[PDB]
Amino acid sequence: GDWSALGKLLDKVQAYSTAGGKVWLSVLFIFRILLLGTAVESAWGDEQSAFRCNTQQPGCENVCYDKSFPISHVRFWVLQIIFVSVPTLLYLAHVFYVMRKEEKLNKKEERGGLLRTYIISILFKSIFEVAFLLIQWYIYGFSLSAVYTCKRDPCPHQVDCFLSRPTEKTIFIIFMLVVSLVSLALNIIELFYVFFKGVKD
Amino acid sequence: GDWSALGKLLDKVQAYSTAGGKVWLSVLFIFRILLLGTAVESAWGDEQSAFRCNTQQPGCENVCYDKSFPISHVRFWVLQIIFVSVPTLLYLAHVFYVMRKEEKLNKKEERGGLLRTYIISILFKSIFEVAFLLIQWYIYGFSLSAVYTCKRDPCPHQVDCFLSRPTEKTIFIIFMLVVSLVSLALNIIELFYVFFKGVKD
Amino acid sequence: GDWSALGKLLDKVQAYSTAGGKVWLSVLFIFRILLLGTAVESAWGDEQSAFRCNTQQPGCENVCYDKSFPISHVRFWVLQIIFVSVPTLLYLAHVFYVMRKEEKLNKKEERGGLLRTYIISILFKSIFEVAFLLIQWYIYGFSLSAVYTCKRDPCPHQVDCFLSRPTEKTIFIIFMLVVSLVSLALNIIELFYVFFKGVKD
Amino acid sequence: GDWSALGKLLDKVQAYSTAGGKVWLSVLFIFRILLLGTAVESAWGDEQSAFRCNTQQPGCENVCYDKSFPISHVRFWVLQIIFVSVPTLLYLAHVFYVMRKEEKLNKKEERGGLLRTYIISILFKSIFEVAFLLIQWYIYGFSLSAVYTCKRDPCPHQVDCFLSRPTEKTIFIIFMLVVSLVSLALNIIELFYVFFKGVKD
Amino acid sequence: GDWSALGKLLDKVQAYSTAGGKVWLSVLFIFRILLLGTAVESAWGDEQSAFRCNTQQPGCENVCYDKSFPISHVRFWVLQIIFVSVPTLLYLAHVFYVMRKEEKLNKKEERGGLLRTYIISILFKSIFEVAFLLIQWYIYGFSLSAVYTCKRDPCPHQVDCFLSRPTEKTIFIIFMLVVSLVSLALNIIELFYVFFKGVKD
Amino acid sequence: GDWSALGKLLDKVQAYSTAGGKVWLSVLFIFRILLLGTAVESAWGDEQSAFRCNTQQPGCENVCYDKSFPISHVRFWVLQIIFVSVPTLLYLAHVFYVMRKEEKLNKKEERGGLLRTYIISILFKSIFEVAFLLIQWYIYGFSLSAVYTCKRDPCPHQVDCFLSRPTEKTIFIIFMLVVSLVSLALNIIELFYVFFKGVKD
Ligand SMILES: CC(C)CCC[C@@H](C)[C@H]1CC[C@H]2[C@@H]3CC=C4C[C@@H](OC(=O)CCC(=O)O)CC[C@]4(C)[C@H]3CC[C@]12C
Ligand SMILES: CC(C)CCC[C@@H](C)[C@H]1CC[C@H]2[C@@H]3CC=C4C[C@@H](OC(=O)CCC(=O)O)CC[C@]4(C)[C@H]3CC[C@]12C
Ligand SMILES: CC(C)CCC[C@@H](C)[C@H]1CC[C@H]2[C@@H]3CC=C4C[C@@H](OC(=O)CCC(=O)O)CC[C@]4(C)[C@H]3CC[C@]12C
Ligand SMILES: CC(C)CCC[C@@H](C)[C@H]1CC[C@H]2[C@@H]3CC=C4C[C@@H](OC(=O)CCC(=O)O)CC[C@]4(C)[C@H]3CC[C@]12C
Ligand SMILES: CC(C)CCC[C@@H](C)[C@H]1CC[C@H]2[C@@H]3CC=C4C[C@@H](OC(=O)CCC(=O)O)CC[C@]4(C)[C@H]3CC[C@]12C
Ligand SMILES: CCCCCCCCCCCCCC
Ligand SMILES: CCCCCCCCCCCCCC
Ligand SMILES: CCCCCCCCCCCCCC
Ligand SMILES: CCCCCCCCCCCCCC
Ligand SMILES: CCCCCCCCCCCCCC
Ligand SMILES: CCCCCCCCCCCCCC
């Protein structure tokens, strides 16, 4: 039995968090990863192979697909989740090393230090979430249409192209938007709780 | 040997459940996941590649497939199982944190609190199951036909399209319906048992 | 070292079984799963992609393949093995919970109960095996021919279609039949042994 | 530290084996599995997709491929290795249960039994190896030619077909033959050793 | 519980490193591997299958693709990360063996040795990073264009070819460049810290 | 904590090896396996599917590809590494069994034996490496050209065929050659060290 120090680490990491935030946020993270890995990823498999355009011009399909989709939704979401997750990993590593140093100090010699970093990490999580949402809104919006109009060389004049599985992708896009909004709300709630408990001194 | 606290956690989680519900429900969950992962998923692999329509119009197959299948059955079932499973995970996390707090209290100082949450979780499981069943009934029904009639642009007039493996998919749809009904019945039985043991005080 | 309770569980599960049945049945289960997972599954990979028919009618291949194979052999066998395996898992869970309850009783306070369930589980294993064998015999038989005659709309008149790897699939079908028969015989032997030891009182 | 009983089990399993047989046979088994899993399996991937025949007759390629290859070499070898391996697993299970029973006896109450089964297992290993070698020799031989002549309906007269990667497959076939011969020789040596140590009493 | 010597090893490995370098560099390594494995690798899947050229000359596409891409970006990055990682593994092995030898010495008999190797390893990490960046700049630059002009035999005169997913690949190239620059900066900072603490004696 | 006997085994295995050989050779093995598994294997995926020839003769591509590549480079390298690795596994097994026997002897009864086998194993490692290098030099050389000339039936006269990714494969071939040479040099150094320490007695 060697799982005790893990309990101590967990307790020290979540010193300033609310009772409900732990459960809700962790389960949301698990839900996010499972949804992205099982169902979402497979629906984008034939994103380019099933993409078709009405033309005989060689090379037009390539450029029209590139123009329609500068970056895939799934890879964008992977980047988003990695960026939202990195700060917590940094905080965990910092806490681990601090605990080791404190053990050294208090063995050989028989607020603000960690609160500030925690606040910064939460702020950066929220900032990254908002930035990714804004970028997605600017680039794509939150829906996909069946027919796309392409006006890029070497295609002559304008051509019509047809997407793959637009409705299913729209449904999943809405799901991901809802998940992101919930996560942002929870993080904002945590920030307000910490600041409102700090005011009373 | 460090598996004792796991036994305590398991005992405290299942305080209010019946003797048979544990076994039947857990085995049903295992059966559900195995069936979805091994046999069901592979049968839908060529759902769009083997989909064909009788026409020379470019883009008609894409739109007709999109209209026929707004969302795949397998991904719908994955969403259903995740939604049905989340509440139990939330309850487990809550119980774990409560047990840690109680250990702190009863070490340093040498009904209704948890019953309500358990009842709420069971109710939400049943609610999600019923909602998913109703949505599936409204959208698809519980069978698939070999020939589909498509009347969507840019297809001219109406066209005929042909599905892949309709009979096998019908069989698996019936299987999944039966499994869902059994799960709903077991949850309702658990609710009735708890309420009937609460009446006698 | 924390593997003792596992030994106790194993001993209590196999109280009423014969000496040889354990080894033979467990090794048969391992053989079944390995054979199904390694060699059998790969041979059915191109079951529909390599299926061909002599015709120019669009949609005829889809319907003819659907008629020829209402359900794939591999998925049928997966269903069979899952159904044959579930009762033992149920019995194991029941025994585990009973043992925990008995430990509680005999710690705090310092035939027929389990025999009946064991008999029922063995009976249901045999029943499922026989039912699956009968269904397979009725639907397919125990061989596959190279040429198939199709008389389904929209195909005009009758058409000829050609299967993929008929001889190899026939060989594997015979193998699976032999395995199923051996398993059924072993289960029947166990039933006879228990009933013949119960007669002498 | 709970690895002691494993050492006892290993010692009791290999009571009657020679000093060198252990190492050589175990390393040969590891070599066999690695070779089959890493290099051999990938070389047969496009066995049917790259198979081609000179004809316009629909369905001729299917039947000609089926006639040329009643069963794939890789799946045949998988069956061979499973059959050669099962007896040792049976013997291990028997020894495990016997050891548990003996522990019970010698705790509560503070040659020929196992030798015969070991001899039978070794004999069956050798028998299966020889049978598989004979079957392979009768069906295929130990080489593959680039051009195959097909005289099966519905192909008219005779047609020429061309295999994929014949030389590489020939090389691997020779490798597998050598491995099988070495294994058979080692098993025969073990049999002779046991019988020659039994003669002196 | 047998995780203590691992703690000692970790402490002795990071004797001369700064407090922040540990966390930042380790998290950067994890980020690098995750990004390369999840999102980046899949975007290059159809790098050659979707590559197209405007010509009827057989063999022109092969040679034009070979000329355009002497080596794939993903495999280049895999080589880069392996080369950047090997020195730390060498240092860890050296430290492990030195610790074992010191344990022998100090049990049986009841700066510069390791600092130099650490400095050399850090220097080589930075050197490899810079070399790979320079090679990539010389060969490809840091962007990809949609249209490529090919003037290689047997293609007649010059031909136009079209890439797959140029914009997404450009985005990921920029990401990887930023990551490499950050890693180089951190290593240089570590070198300066060690040399500036060595000056004061 | 049960990792002590592993330390003893490691110490006894490396009794006669030099201080640096351990680290360098082990890291080289890890580098070899990682390089072969991650980057090299994927570059040969479309070795036959992207192989093309200028002709209308059916069957010519098959025979020309077979003649050009009697065996794939990746599978050749897998065979090489397995052959180079087997002797060390044999030596480890022998040492393990010898240690068990010595424990028996020295518990119940409260150079040349192993040196010779170690020398033989090292010699065989070097021999296999040299043999594989010579075979590769004789068959292929150490580069690949873009255009191949084929003069095999049923192709008429001579035909031109075009390879896939020749430059990248050439680069990786050079890398593997360098790795093999380094490994051979290290093994020769170990042999010279042991023989030069044996001369002084
Ligand atoms: C082993 C390596 C290569 C990958 C797996 C390690 C990390 C990437 C994992 C381990 C624990 C995970 C965390 C577990 C749960 C949370 C929930 C959530 O964070 C919080 O709940 C913070 C507030 C709180 O916990 O009280 C956001 C994701 C996060 C940080 C996870 C992010 C990813 C983490 C750091
Ligand atoms: C490790 C993480 C990333 C994924 C795996 C963890 C959970 C998703 C698993 C662990 C235990 C599972 C549960 C085990 C068994 C049950 C049976 C069933 O629930 C009940 O039986 C509730 C009533 C009772 O147990 O008495 C419904 C599924 C559920 C909750 C499972 C849902 C999924 C759970 C929570
Ligand atoms: C971890 C979960 C998600 C999947 C793996 C757990 C079960 C599906 C496994 C564990 C042990 C297995 C059993 C091990 C061996 C047997 C042999 C055989 O049953 C018997 O031999 C019963 C009679 C006897 O054992 O004496 C039939 C399969 C069965 C029950 C297996 C069925 C599948 C079981 C229950
Ligand atoms: C099990 C084998 C087959 C593969 C996995 C083992 C190694 C390849 C791993 C184990 C730990 C890893 C290291 C963990 C973290 C670091 C962070 C970073 O190095 C440092 O931070 C050095 C400075 C410091 O740690 O203070 C660069 C990658 C590196 C060395 C990693 C490189 C890859 C390592 C050596
Ligand atoms: C678990 C099984 C199925 C596969 C994995 C086990 C073996 C194939 C591994 C375990 C340790 C490995 C060895 C670890 C390191 C070395 C380095 C190198 O050998 C030496 O360094 C010998 C000289 C020395 O170590 O001092 C060549 C590869 C070799 C023997 C490896 C070959 C493959 C080995 C034997
Ligand atoms: C008993 C719990 C079962 C969990 C099922 C997990 C399925 C595997 C999904 C792996 C891909 C998603 C994570 C990247
Ligand atoms: C001994 C028990 C064997 C269990 C077989 C499991 C097969 C692997 C299936 C993995 C996919 C389904 C879960 C997502
Ligand atoms: C040392 C034993 C090796 C076992 C080989 C297992 C091969 C992996 C097969 C996985 C698929 C079959 C189970 C679903
Ligand atoms: C350190 C040892 C590495 C072992 C490499 C194993 C490669 C994985 C091969 C898995 C397929 C073959 C077994 C079925
Ligand atoms: C709970 C943490 C989940 C981690 C997700 C990892 C996904 C698997 C990615 C594997 C490929 C990248 C490493 C090579
Ligand atoms: C933390 C270390 C990560 C190691 C990455 C390994 C990637 C998986 C590669 C597996 C194929 C190569 C071995 C056969």
CATH, residue D123: 1.20.1440.80
**Which secondary-structure segment (H or E) carries B52?**
strand B52-53
Beta carbons of E50 and A48 less than 8 angstroms apart: yes
Between CA C161 and CA D154 the distance in angstroms is: 11
Give the dihedral of Cα atoms B104, B107, B112, B116; nearest 10 deg: 40
Interface of B with C (CB under 8 A): 1-3, 7, 11, 19, 22-24, 26-27, 30-31, 34-35, 38-39, 42-43, 46, 50, 52-54, 146-147, 160-168, 171
The alpha carbon of D161 and the centre of ligand 9 are apart by a number of angstroms equal to 36
Provide the residue type at C128 as one letter: F
> What is the stated resolution of the deposited model, in angstroms?
2.3
Q: Phi/psi at C198 (nearest 5 deg)?
A: -75, -20
**Chain E nearest-CA residue for A89:** E27
Between CA E101 and CA E104 the distance in angstroms is: 5
List strands edge to edge, sheet with C147-150. Answer: C52-53, C159-162, C147-150
Q: How many CA atoms lie within 13 A of F121 on its CB side?
A: 20
> Which tokens is F7 given?
């330390």
> Which tokens is B19 given?
């003797």
Nearest to C60 by CA among C153, C158, C160, C163: C153
The alpha carbon of D152 and the centre of ligand 8 are apart by a number of angstroms equal to 38
Using CB atoms, list chains with 3+ pairs below 8 Å to chain B: A, C
Give the DSSP per-residue string, E71-107: S-HHHHHHHHHHHHHHHHHHHHHHHHHHHHHHHHHHH
Three-state DSSP state, C150: strand
Q: Is the CB of E37 under 6 A from ligand 10?
A: yes
State how many domains chain F has. 1
A62–E164 CB contact, under 8 Å: yes
In this structure, the residue with its CA closest to atom 33 of ligand 2 is: B85
Distance from CA of F1 to the nearest CA of E (A): 5
Residues in Cβ contact with E59 at an 8 Å cutoff, skipping those fewer than 6 apart: E154, F52, F54, F147, F160, F162
Beta carbons of E74 and E41 less than 8 angstroms apart: yes
Q: Phi/psi at B48 (nearest 5 deg)?
A: -105, -30
Give the DSSP per-residue string, B147-192: EEEE--TTS-S-EEEE-SSHHHHHHHHHHHHHHHHHHHHHHHHHHH
> Which tokens is B46 given?
């060529």
Give the DSSP per-residue string, E110-175: ---TTHHHHHHHHHHHHHHHHHHHHHHHHHT-S---SEEEE--TTS-S-EEEE-SSHHHHHHHHHH
In this structure, the residue with its CA closest to atom 11 of ligand 5 is: F89
F174 to each of F127, F166, F171, how far by Cα in Å?
Answer: 21, 12, 5
Pairing of strands D52-53, F147-150: unpaired
Beta carbons of F25 and F183 less than 8 angstroms apart: yes
Distance from CA of A49 to the nearest CA of B (A): 10
> Which tokens is F121 given?
């194993």
Q: Is the CB of B33 under 6 A from ligand 2?
A: no
D50–F63 CB contact, under 8 Å: no
Pairing of strands B159-162, B147-150: antiparallel
Pairing of strands D159-162, D147-150: antiparallel
Distance from CA of D37 to the nearest CA of C (A): 11
Nearest to F164 by CA among F136, F149, F144, F137: F144
Using CB atoms, list chains with 3+ pairs below 8 Å to chain E: A, F
Q: Which residue reads 């498999």 in tokens?
A: A45
Three-state DSSP state, D55: coil
Domain range holding C118? 3-200
The alpha carbon of E100 and the centre of ligand 9 are apart by a number of angstroms equal to 30
Pocket of ligand 3 (CB under 6 A): B 30; C 14, 17, 21-22, 25-26, 29, 85, 88-89
Between CA C112 and CA C118 the distance in angstroms is: 10
First-to-last alpha carbon distance for chain A, in angstroms, is 40
Write out chain C residues lying below 8 Å of D79, CB-based.
35, 39
Three-state DSSP state, B44: coil
B93–A54 CB contact, under 8 Å: no
List strands edge to edge, sheet with F147-150. Answer: F52-53, F159-162, F147-150
> Which tokens is B8 given?
């305590």
Between CA C135 and CA C141 the distance in angstroms is: 9
Write out chain F residues lying below 8 Å of D167, CB-based.
66, 70-71
**Best of A26, A27, A31, A33 for a ligand 10 pocket test (most atoms within 8 Å of beta carbon):** A33
Whether E and A touch, i.e. at least 3 CB pairs below 8 A, reads as yes
Give the DSSP per-residue string, chain A: ---HHHHHHHHHHTTTS-HHHHHHHHHHHHHHHHHIIIIIHHHTTTTTTT-EES---TTHHHHHHHHH-SS-HHHHHHHHHHHHHHHHHHHHHHHHHHHHHHHHHHHHT---TTHHHHHHHHHHHHHHHHHHHHHHHHHT-S---SEEEE--TTS-S-EEEE-SSHHHHHHHHHHHHHHHHHHHHHHHHHHHHHHHHHHT-
Between CA D176 and CA C192 the distance in angstroms is: 45
> Which tokens is D114 given?
């196992």
A54–B49 CB contact, under 8 Å: no
> Which tokens is B7 given?
């036994």
Interface of B with A (CB under 8 A): 1-2, 48-49, 58-59, 62-63, 66, 69-72, 74-75, 78-79, 82, 86, 89-90, 93-94, 97, 154
List strands edge to edge, sheet with A159-162. Answer: A52-53, A159-162, A147-150
Distance from CA of C152 to the nearest CA of B (A): 11
**Best of B25, B27, B28, B33 for a ligand 6 pocket test (most atoms within 8 Å of beta carbon):** B33
Q: Which residue reads 């642009």 in tokens?
A: B153
Residues in Cβ contact with A201 at an 8 Å cutoff, skipping those fewer than 6 apart: none
How many of the other CB atoms lie within 10 Å of CB of E27?
16
